Design an enzyme around this catalytic site. Structure first.
Site, PDB file in Angstrom:
ATOM      1  CB  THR A  36      -0.976   0.066   1.199  1.00 36.88           C
ATOM      2  OG1 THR A  36      -0.281  -0.221   2.400  1.00 36.88           O
ATOM      3  CG2 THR A  36      -2.084  -0.951   1.042  1.00 36.88           C
ATOM      4  CE1 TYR A  84       4.406   8.562   3.345  1.00 34.49           C
ATOM      5  CE2 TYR A  84       5.707   7.905   1.472  1.00 34.49           C
ATOM      6  CZ  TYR A  84       4.477   8.166   2.032  1.00 34.49           C
ATOM      7  OH  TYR A  84       3.322   8.088   1.249  1.00 34.49           O
ATOM      8  NE  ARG A  90      -3.680   9.464  10.226  1.00 36.31           N
ATOM      9  CZ  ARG A  90      -4.872   8.863  10.296  1.00 36.31           C
ATOM     10  NH1 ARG A  90      -5.886   9.239   9.525  1.00 36.31           N
ATOM     11  NH2 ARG A  90      -5.040   7.873  11.172  1.00 36.31           N
ATOM     12  N   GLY A 135      -1.766   6.216  -4.060  1.00 36.62           N
ATOM     13  CA  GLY A 135      -1.589   5.185  -5.069  1.00 36.62           C
ATOM     14  C   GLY A 135      -1.954   5.731  -6.420  1.00 36.62           C
TER      15      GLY A 135
END
Ligand SMILES: C/C=C(\Oc1cccc(C(=O)O)c1O)C(=O)O
Lengths: 505, 505, 505, 505
Positions: free
Chosen positions: A409, A433, A453, A469
């Site tokens: 993801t 990240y 986040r 994405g």
């Protein structure tokens, strides 16, 4: 029998014979503490401390939160080699491959598997996205701006597990017997008991109020990319995908703010504004033992969770905004379910998860369940599935993590080609990240959140990176804006957190 | 816009024109407070204060708790007449029938129906079981030992609603304009704002720790009845039932302990040991404004709940112990469901609920749902159903309460004959036992718990009354013991609460 | 408008312009016919006729049955080449690869896609197991005893679809325009209408009763293998599997009876004794147009079903006997679900299905649903799942069949290695056993049953082959007996069918 | 053991000692018969014969149909007294109250309670609506045009139960031993065996085809009321209801056609066009033993069903047209569920059912389940619930019928006031309309359909009566038309049935 009965020396002795880590515990009633207040008391924002909380679907806090009350010691990486910050004894693995160092550390420090909270002790911290460089060959085009180590995991031996249901805290001081020998047993007990006594007295202190107000100013921040630069990267990737280079890729960019606001204050605003299944605040120490930097996040998705021999993942893909409102909310759900494209994207990631787990689970155990169902979060809903497998004989929780790393993801499908494309289009190395924050507990379990986040806070600067994405029909501006907005949730929280004041002040 | 923005004078004016009660509110962040810590700060165990909390099924605390921060004033009963304790203005109904007095008070003080927490203000307190004497003709054989009034309801105008999800507290100071006139508007606003400012500053104070340990000593207590006396009362009632006098009746007896332990400490032990869907702590004031007595309870069952025009009840009957464990737990459920007798008992009470509500709901709206399903609590499971109806035109929340009062689960079926039998067999008047504790909020809603698993604490003595349903095949000893054990849960908690100490002290 | 209104010439003309096959239909009321009685009338056991019926889970007959009323013509194989039996025109593909011949035939004879029953016309028949020899390289150790062609599919143009819900029959006479030209249109119509008129008048005939009785004698039959020979083959395969040659393999053996009983009579006893989701009776013609042999079966499992672009499979594995009874039945289900081994076996086959379909479905469409749930049949229950995928662009129903062929449930996992092992251990070529019986309709759909629990009836002899899955812990005798018993279901039915007599005769 | 093995004399003897009715049975294979074809063979439209079939929700025929093969004898009513048509012995209750006569007949002729189909023998026929006149006092304003008896029930001793799943028929010849004595045992057996032999040989006969076509002409028919007369009756009733005379009332009117078409042909068209959970065709004999009249119906709703001690009812109210189509179908369901008025109407009838059953079921057993859920029929959907109760000690299936009679769905709520209003507004006595058709079997069970969507066919005339529920906001024209249309379903079927012809004739 007293509530706060500490583990007996007699029992510790028996346990010490069996394993190199023996938790010594004491349960107290703490019905006037929250996880945050307990953290303030037990950790006080000190280097090597952390707080982990969980709100499933951003609605209803789960039973447990976990506080790390000062880890003198952490396994990390310097100049490509495994090193401990703070002092460890001779038998603690050092030098070389950090993953192997971590693997042996966990083999050495296993415990029994009792009554304990889910996390009572273990290695707690992060893996950078760029740890993937050691599992897959990747080009080295993007510049390493942030210079973070591939990993850093606290040896978290003093832990407070806060039970919201009972209103209790279970204090754990784990005795770590590296050398495995019979010697120092009674010393180890008294040492553990003394660490319990320290946490206990810290809990005994009073506390000033933090009852507060705040406003929500728009933050001023720096972006790596304009709408044009970003929209064109997206178009590039849309072209690759149309040609069949990949099905999906997750580009991101970095945003930044200068701020001197305490990290906990950012955590506080995130907790109120974007509660999530993985909240974390972590004070990462340096070799000197002061805070090198701080990680504050509210993540919506685990990479992997390992529990009693089984590794489980929860692929998440497909989005609608929650309804404004209730009739609209159901239209949106019927719509997401009926969106054949997004169904396909979700299925790709579900298959990727099946395969990831296939690398380390016994054949004929890797199954999908609750396939492609809806979950509501505070502001959006997604499709979600469960992929779960039995860890293969002689495989470890860490094998589960590396086998899954990084989340599809946050990379794409297929994963390597997507990483390759990410590296072509991104200015800097991702750092944390798309990495994970989480723990590997001594009993063999593990839970890691995808590091999104999330703010990394260093020397007067807060970094927040965000992405999204890309697929066959993605639009450049739409993706730029969706990405920026993800980032602004965190940036907004930092700006809010700066206004925190006692009401009418 | 600031988080703690108080309602504007401009807005208050408009609201004051429309209704005799205008809530003035201020929301603050309070992520280091629990309901208990907030109570300590805002109420400090003062007369006319309360705390209400809720754990559905004794598992997972719900979103809201409500604290009453000092009600100077309460509607109650003296020598059969309605009287206010503390000072109220000329237009406040007094003298006469207390129910009528309460009815008019609620008609007068309605509000709009916004954004507010479930309870933001209203009449908060209890109805004694013996209030039923004013709705049904009953014999007067049992002696009135405790001498409690039929009702006492605080006019709770200063309320703090604690939101566990957001980590926030919403402070409400309701302006009560009895006379309904235009005069004093701006004065009312400033007064409300000043009460907000008081609660705010109280929240601003520091607090010492209550982190604690305790043990569980067996309490020494007095019982009204021996196993023999109780077993014979049960046999008497079994005989009446076999003859067809009733289907079921719920006898009880009173137990007592002398203790000087603070009520909140008992609440704390109940909260840890027997969390329930209705927790309450209430300091009931006297005419002098000191504490007359204290009510501490953890109740498993509502009498009735009224919300947006609908009254709802949840009949509960049928029990098994939770499983020790998981396979045993399911055997027990299949067993309770297959217990045709208990199914019948439960259905009797479901029908009784349908009828109770039939008295005040529009014909063709009173329905049963989720019929006779299982619910797990901490130590036992039950059968449970939902009966819900639309309040008939011109009927009120209070009509719902009186129409249902007292719970069939605390009286029997049919209800009057059961009450009659209760009166024949019980030594003393029940007082609060089998009554309700709860509120009637100004917007028209209501929520009342059945007053069971509750201690009433007066002048060095704690009373705990307990009972259980008698049916055709009940055994005297079994019922004696089941009843005593219900009581001991509370008695045990008082004894525990007496050991509360800072750990290692 | 009349019920039996035949398609208009005007409408046929329009359709003939668009496609090379045009169904001409007529619906009649037939509330005094069953599928069998209609078959008797319309087909009368003639070569090239068939009946297909379906009882889901062996409980409740589905809506439709389909009767083939005389196919003058069939595509099959002689000396490795594709040939038609009966006469076809010049443009009908012949010679060469039979699969390619079948592929082009279906490309040519597609129809529109209306109102029609599920099967209104198409290619109807079987593929031998040994057709797999043309898709995968296999050793040629076992002897070809039965000498069946790899395939034989009737060009079934006269079809009666029996609707059990409406009590109606829809008669279809399909006009097959091979050359695709405008010529003979009006001739084609009248020809189709005449075939309708023939079926109609056949339905108009009276019929004698078959009301009947029968007994269940034990059949005398020949087996290829003793308990010892079979148990040792099983032990061999258990050894291969333990070493990791395969996870599972499905050996079988052949049994035989001499009998002159009509095939329909065997069908009748199967229908009563072992109703199944795929019942079939097929009269396979020779080049002379008499019956070469007859296939009678009741199969529990489809290979694949294709409908409106989607291919779907239903892997079945895991067994318990149905309960004798109702409490026992649930114990057995909880047991099968809790059988981790069988769960694993089932999952292996589910994955094999995902992959099979992956070969011909668009990536990101192949999903599993209703995973591993229980289904009850007349005598046993199984675990069952659904695997369904979107046929990839330019892929056909026949690609779905070949991509899945043969069922993993009749071969094993992984499939080739299992086939290899089957070939090492089995005496003769399987023939139809483990192949499929079914259809490819002109609209693009398809439904094929696995050819098990089936008798092939030739020149006074009936062959029934049966087998069962071997895994790591299989026992030789147990498998021998389970296999023989599967076979005896069919053998018993043949012996029963021989006793069929008018009651008291 | 042979399939058609008849019960042994030895076994019959034992049974004859125990009960006054002994079924003697023989099962045959009948895979080329349908219920209709079997009826034709076994009953041949003779007086005192019947066929009962069932299609749940008008979709999927259930397992069983039941054929009555000639009842020489029926209990009915002449000049208010109970009388048998055809000959019965001295001990058969006659004269007086027909309900009491029926009650004693059932007490006498009970059987054991084995293996038998649901109906293997009993009293089979109807109760007129006007039977209610003997259970409730009603005015006698409307004229008795049709002059039907309050009841007529065949003593159905020769029954064929057709099992669609097995393809079998179970033939039952019940020996009725009224006098209860030991005498004639062996004679009774041979007599029963001879009746079996008759049914058997009848099944042995051939049959001509009824394969057929038909068209759907609009029927010409007579109505009792114009749109104006009917719309005004509806307005009258709307006024009564608004005032609170009743919540709901179900007025109807009668329509008529002259026709000489066989009743079975009407049944055939109903079966195809409006399949329902209760299909019936009944030939009602006269005292001479020819057919007095014929009842043909397809009813959507049972009055009551009694099985193994429990009486169950299925209140049905609330309608939408099925969707045209699938998206529209779901909108309609969400709409019906959201229709608070119709919810209320349905609940009224559910309560009425609870009470009806309360009259004859043990207190604490009458429950509602599957409350107010949706069911789809061929053309409409409804709300539906289940009300089920345990028959009270010494209460009978007939007590269940009378306690429920007539359906609230054909009368109204409250029921008597509604009947009263029906009597004020209706021209003629209802006769069978709103009565029931069904059976009381010898084992104690019962199943009755509400007599709606039914034709009564007498001397060249067919009567079809139809109506619909009136509530507060009903519109006169809308109700007139909805009622007429209900009737036209049957009238249309009669007109269709008249066109029945062999295809192309
Ligand atoms: C709520 C259900 C039950 O609890 C009670 C029923 C009646 C009386 C009592 C009591 O505590 O006196 C009680 O706990 C039960 O035991 O069935």
């Amino acid at each position: 029998a007293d509530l706060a009965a500490t583990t007996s020396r007699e029992d510790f002795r028996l346990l010490a014979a069996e394993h190199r880590v023996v938790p010594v515990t004491r349960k107290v009633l703490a019905d006037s503490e929250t996880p945050l207040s307990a953290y303030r008391k037990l950790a006080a924002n000190r280097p090597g401390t952390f707080l982990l909380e969980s709100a499933e679907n951003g609605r209803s806090w789960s039973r447990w939160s976990f506080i790390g009350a000062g880890a003198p010691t952490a396994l990390t990486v310097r100049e490509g080699q495994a090193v401990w910050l703070g002092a460890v004894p001779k038998d603690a693995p050092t030098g070389g491959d950090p993953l192997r160092a971590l693997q042996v550390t966990l083999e050495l420090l296993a415990t029994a598997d009792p009554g304990l909270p889910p996390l009572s002790g273990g290695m707690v911290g992060f893996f950078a996205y760029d740890m993937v460089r050691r599992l897959e060959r990747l080009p080295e085009r993007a510049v390493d701006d942030l210079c973070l180590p591939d990993m850093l995991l606290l040896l978290a031996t003093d832990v407070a597990a806060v039970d919201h249901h009972e209103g209790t805290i279970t204090l754990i001081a784990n005795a770590v017997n590296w050398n495995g020998t019979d010697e120092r047993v009674d010393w180890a007990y008294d040492d553990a008991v003394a660490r319990l006594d320290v946490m206990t007295a810290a809990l005994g202190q009073p506390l000033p109020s933090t009852v507060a107000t705040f406003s929500r100013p728009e933050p001023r921040h720096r972006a790596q990319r304009t709408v044009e630069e970003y929209g064109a990267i997206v178009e590039y990737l849309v072209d690759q995908i149309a040609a069949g280079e990949a099905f999906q890729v997750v580009p991101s960019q970095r945003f930044e703010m200068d701020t001197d606001v305490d990290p906990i204050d950012v955590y506080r605003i995130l907790r109120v504004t974007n509660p999530s299944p993985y909240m974390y605040l972590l004070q990462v120490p340096n070799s000197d033992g002061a805070v090198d930097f701080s990680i504050v996040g509210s993540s919506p998705e685990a990479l992997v969770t390992v529990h009693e021999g089984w590794a489980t993942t929860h692929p998440i893909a497909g989005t609608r905004w929650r309804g404004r409102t209730d009739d609209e909310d159901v239209l949106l759900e019927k719509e997401l379910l009926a969106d054949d494209k997004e169904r396909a994207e979700h299925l790709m990631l579900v298959d990727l998860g099946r395969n990831d787990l296939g690398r380390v689970c016994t054949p004929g155990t890797v199954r999908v369940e609750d396939y492609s169902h809806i979950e509501r979060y505070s502001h959006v809903m997604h499709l979600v599935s469960t992929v779960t497998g039995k860890l293969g004989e002689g495989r470890t929780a860490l094998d589960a993590v590396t086998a899954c790393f990084p989340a599809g993801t946050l990379s794409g499908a297929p994963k390597v080609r997507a990483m390759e494309l990410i590296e072509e289009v991104e200015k800097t190395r991702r750092g944390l990240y798309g990495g994970v924050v989480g723990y590997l507990d001594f009993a063999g379990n593990a839970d890691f959140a995808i590091a999104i986040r999330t703010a990394l806070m260093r020397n007067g600067t807060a970094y927040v990176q965000a992405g999204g994405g890309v697929v066959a029909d993605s639009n450049g501006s739409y993706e730029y804006n969706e990405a920026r907005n993800k980032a602004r949730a965190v940036l907004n929280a930092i700006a809010a957190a700066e206004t925190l004041a006692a009401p009418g002040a």
